[PDB]
Amino acid sequence: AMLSPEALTTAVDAAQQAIALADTLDVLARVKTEHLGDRSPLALARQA
RNA sequence: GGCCAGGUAGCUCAGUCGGUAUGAGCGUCCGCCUGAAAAGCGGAAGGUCGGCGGUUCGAUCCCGCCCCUGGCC
């Protein structure tokens, strides 16, 4: 099982950092697809 | 008024009685391509699955109410 507490924290810390570096709404939409869509790292985690 | 059957992507519709709708066709975007296009080929974006709540670690799928189409009245 690859859902350790430091595994999800590695994804959230990388997601919130990219969200913090989103300066326009178009960039945020691209970040949303990579960190909250059905192909995000959290997606493969929640799919298991 | 009854037990049902339906509301799902921009359009027209499939599909699942709990952890991915690997959704389809067409519509939208990028690349190869063309003077520029389209087709073709190869990549992608986009749905809070009818609304408000209930159960649950987690609900398009299970409970209750309501909204709107139909079938029978």
UniProtKB/Swiss-Prot annotation:
Coiled-coil ranges per the record?
Answer: none
Give its localization: Cytoplasm
Cystine pairs annotated here are: none
Specify the domain of life of the species encoding this protein.
Bacteria
Q: Which family does it belong to?
A: Belongs to the class-II aminoacyl-tRNA synthetase family. Phe-tRNA synthetase alpha subunit type 1 subfamily.
Query: What does the annotation say about its assembly with partners?
Result: Tetramer of two alpha and two beta subunits.
What name does UniProt use for this protein? Phenylalanine--tRNA ligase alpha subunit
Q: Which organism is it from?
A: Mycobacterium tuberculosis (strain ATCC 25618 / H37Rv)
Question: What gene is behind this protein?
Answer: pheS
Q: Which residues of the full protein are shown?
A: 1 to 47 of 341
